[PDB]
Design a protein around this nucleic acid. Structure first.
Ligand code: ZN
Lengths: 93, 95, 72, 107, 34, 80, 107, 93, 84, 95
DNA sequence: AGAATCCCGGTGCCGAGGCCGCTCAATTGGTCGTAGACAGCTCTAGCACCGCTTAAACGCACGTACGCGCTGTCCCCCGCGTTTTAACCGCCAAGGGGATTACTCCCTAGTCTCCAGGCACGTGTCAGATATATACATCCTGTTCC
DNA sequence: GGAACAGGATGTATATATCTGACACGTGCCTGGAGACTAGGGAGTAATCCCCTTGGCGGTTAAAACGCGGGGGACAGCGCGTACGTGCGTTTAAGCGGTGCTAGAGCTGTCTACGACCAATTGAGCGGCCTCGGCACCGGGATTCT
């Protein structure tokens, strides 16, 4: 069967940042687990926030309050910045 | 005149047998508001909100003081000093 | 003309110098008022490790300049 | 009808479509809005970029070209904020930061 | 070159850790802290 | 201004006595002030962000106990 | 047909129907089995009865005939397994158990 | 509007375990929050378990497994026995 | 086919515990650290194994998996990376 | 002959800079199987399962040892004892 | 003097990354049911105010006891060498069950109708918070016999 | 001087009166829970491939075990002087009770864009192979630390 992961995507990110740097299998699995765990925490937090505000839908606002909850300080600031610019680009497109 | 420590133990007994709030609520509320302008200005706070805040604050501080007492007595002393404070916080993982 | 030196713990020291004094003069003054010998001092201003034999006017150090001190 | 991927539309290397599918089938909410997977993919891309950049810098400070779990642990435990995000984490073959209490060294 | 954030020394492009104060490079967006 | 100083030395003494401590040093009081300030900072930041997402201007006991639940310090008796 | 509540069918005092409603409408899973709410109501009833029984003994012990959060706190904290279950739980107006160190006592 | 709680059920349980034992409103609120918290923990663990086993249904089996995972020792044992008896009595109707 | 095996937790040996302390930054080790370490290590494994085998019996399997190990670890707040 | 302490410090540096496993694989596997003998019977294990188990045990023991070293220096000592062990576990919240 | 570790160069090997084949699931587009965005109205609890009383904090002194070196001791971990032992790697074989596919069946979401259980509301009444008085348990110092 | 004790002062549980506001009980109702029936997919059940796990054996040691010599660190007694408990008088403002305004939380009608479902598709992502370079391991200096 097909087993999904983030291998290609994380590899594209690595090639974007450091062109000549390679990645090992164990570190690659750590990367996949990290992305999965952050996805789980963030999306679960968004789900709970939508539940508390009696909202049945998850939107960019819920995701943004979730990242502002979970990521501290500077990480939250720049994560909101990059996400907002990505959303504006997607809506313009 | 009682020898030192006797009234301290009496205070320990009195406050352990009792559950009322040990923090003056108006100063605590003013402190909470002071912290509050740092995030959003002109906020309105529920009295139950500040009550739950001070309940949790008192519980966290009393647990921290219990752990500090354990630290100090492990250091074969009966007087706590702030080195026990940051030791307890580091051990708990809060810093 | 005063200059300001920053340490690694954020403690700022004030020195009274002139542009004509050399870097080793600043190091000796730091040793005098703080006990930090010139061999322990590494001085950064405008992205340069100030060489001991040169003077302040070579590095364009003006009044109330920001100096970084590193001890090793 | 020429198809352009949502990841390409948003300028993201992360799979916006796969994230949307996981959000739906992961039953976090009854319905999932359109902007949420894009925002989530951007956030994941940012965090991946930070971790990979720090790990690569750590590796190149060791004159090596492959990022390994030791490099990842060094990056995570050397970034204070990423450490706070990752406090309860155990990394396989992570090792520990080199640090000794000053009292243990002679003066 | 990149200039350091902690000690502000003119590190070369190949230096991924600072020469004297020994701090790692930060992003152009986020700079290192004390 | 400086209303953390309103958290009084007798109040810290009472809290320590409830904690079961006999002898209190001098630096304990403002050390406790500092740790209380940072703890309240974190809790209030989370609760105020909850109120922000709620499109509301009144911070409620519900939001504050939800922040407490997030921090691993869940509180009973105030709903939820 | 005559109405007969699912709690009566299971011999439970807890609201099996309400538990099922919170199960489906709380979007934990996209289908909920028929036996799932009954089991959950049973375990909730048993836990509530256990802690209330402990607090009842505490209330009777201190000659007070009304359960108070102080009794609730004594009940949970004097029980090892309930304390482990509620280690991170803070009780309002609960106070703390009377406990000082013996070495803390005067010599 | 109505704000539902476990007040009547908790009162019934307390009366059945203690014919002559009253309760205060604050303690009742504590009990309601406790019941909600335990429900949240158990049901969330069961939903997680069903998700991880690629299962889209919560039944008595994953509820039982979540109970055993959460409750310690003989508390878990007694809770499991009570749940099994309740399920048997309900399905035997 | 699998004979029971008693008296094996002495395999956590004194050099191994000493090496662990050396990694942890411990300067000097007393006599009873080995017995203390072995006991707490057994308790940690016992709690983890109880959770992991509960997962396994729920899955109607007989092979405890690395996945289930991470399952129980994340349940305990001890989440582990690189294993799935 | 080296004075006591220098060899220990070198060992500390080497093991902090290294990342390999510190517990022998077969004894740890036999310990895991012995513990598993009580809950279920005739259990089988994936090799990665006991590997991840060993990773967890290594990390938890290293963190506990670091914590107890901090407790020991706090008590003006450089040698740890089970009093330090129990103090660290108590304040962490397992005892 | 002697041991530990970095710098530099050769050899290998295996696995990381690039390339080919596939297939399935993400795109595109349209439809349609509805979640909520918004406007409007209501009332309530939250902020601000006042004054009074007295509970509690501030400040001062004073004794005192305990935190912090300082010392000496002693015994006990640590480093080192020898012996031994079982961990590890590579090889073998068996088969247990992990995982997969197909069939079917039955169980729960869903809709409709009905109906009664729990929630908002109201009110008597008693658990207890408070007050007063007291005898007994604690605690401490002054006095006395060895 | 040191251990034992009596008595005064203080704190506190114990014995009653009270008045009281929350608590438990009676009630309207309506909305959510229960009974009937459908259907269609989730999941149980049977058969199979073979992945991987268990068991074992032969060397080869790296590592564990044991014992010894000894210097270093835990521990105990000492002393002091400094910081903190204890008590008392004073000062501050916390808290109680009431009032008032209203900003904002909460409930309601609407209609609309926003997101689930379904059909066709095609390229992106995953499974498998091939190679070469980056790193493990090897050895000889050179530097550094004890
Ligand atoms: Zn620098």
């Amino acid at each position: 069967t097909r087993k999904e992961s983030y291998a290609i995507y994380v590899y594209k990110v690595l090639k974007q940042v450091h062109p000549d740097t390679g990645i090992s299998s164990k570190a690659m699995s750590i990367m996949n687990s990290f992305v999965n765990d952050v996805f789980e925490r963030i999306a679960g937090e968004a789900s709970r926030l939508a539940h508390y505000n009696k909202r049945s839908t998850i939107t960019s606002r819920e995701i943004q309050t979730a990242v502002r909850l979970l990521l501290p300080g500077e990480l939250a600031k720049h994560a909101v910045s990059e996400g907002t610019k990505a959303v504006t680009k997607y809506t313009s497109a | 005149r009682y020898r030192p420590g006797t009234v301290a133990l009496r205070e320990i007994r009195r406050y352990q047998k009792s559950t009322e709030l040990l923090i003056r609520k108006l100063p605590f509320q003013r402190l909470v508001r002071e912290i509050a302008q740092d995030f959003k200005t002109d906020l309105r706070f529920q009295s139950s909100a500040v009550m739950a805040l001070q309940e949790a604050s008192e519980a966290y501080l009393v647990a921290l003081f219990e752990d500090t007492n354990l630290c100090a007595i492990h250091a074969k002393r009966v007087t706590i000093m702030p080195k026990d404070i940051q030791l307890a916080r580091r051990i708990r993982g809060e810093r | 003309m005063q200059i300001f030196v920053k340490t690694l713990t954020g403690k700022t020291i004030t020195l009274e110098v002139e542009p004509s004094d050399t870097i080793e003069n600043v190091k000796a003054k730091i040793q005098d008022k703080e006990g930090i010998p010139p061999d322990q001092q590494r001085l950064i201003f405008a992205g340069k490790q100030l060489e001991d034999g040169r003077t302040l006017s070579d590095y364009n150090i003006q009044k109330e300049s920001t100096l970084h001190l590193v001890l090793r | 009808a020429k198809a352009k991927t949502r990841s390409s539309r948003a300028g993201l290397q992360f799979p916006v479509g796969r994230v949307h599918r996981l959000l739906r089938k992961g039953n976090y909410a009854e319905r999932v809005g359109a902007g949420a997977p894009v925002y989530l993919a951007a956030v994941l891309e940012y965090l991946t970029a930070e971790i990979l950049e720090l790990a690569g810098n750590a590796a190149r400070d060791n004159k090596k070209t492959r990022i390994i779990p030791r490099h990842l642990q060094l990056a995570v435990r050397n970034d204070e904020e990423l450490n706070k995000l990752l406090g309860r984490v155990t990394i396989a073959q992570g090792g520990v930061l080199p640090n000794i209490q000053s009292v243990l060294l002679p003066c | 070159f990149w200039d350091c954030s902690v000690c502000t020394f003119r590190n070369s492009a190949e230096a991924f850790k600072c020469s004297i104060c020994d701090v790692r490079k930060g992003t152009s967006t986020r700079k290192p802290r004390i | 201004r400086d209303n953390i100083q309103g958290i009084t030395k007798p109040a810290i003494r009472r809290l320590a006595r409830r904690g079961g401590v006999k002898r209190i040093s001098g630096l304990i009081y403002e050390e406790t002030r500092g740790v209380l300030k940072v703890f309240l900072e974190n809790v209030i930041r989370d609760a105020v962000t909850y109120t922000e997402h709620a499109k509301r201007k009144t911070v409620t006991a519900m939001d504050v106990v939800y922040a407490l639940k997030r921090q691993g310090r869940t509180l009973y008796g105030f709903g939820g």
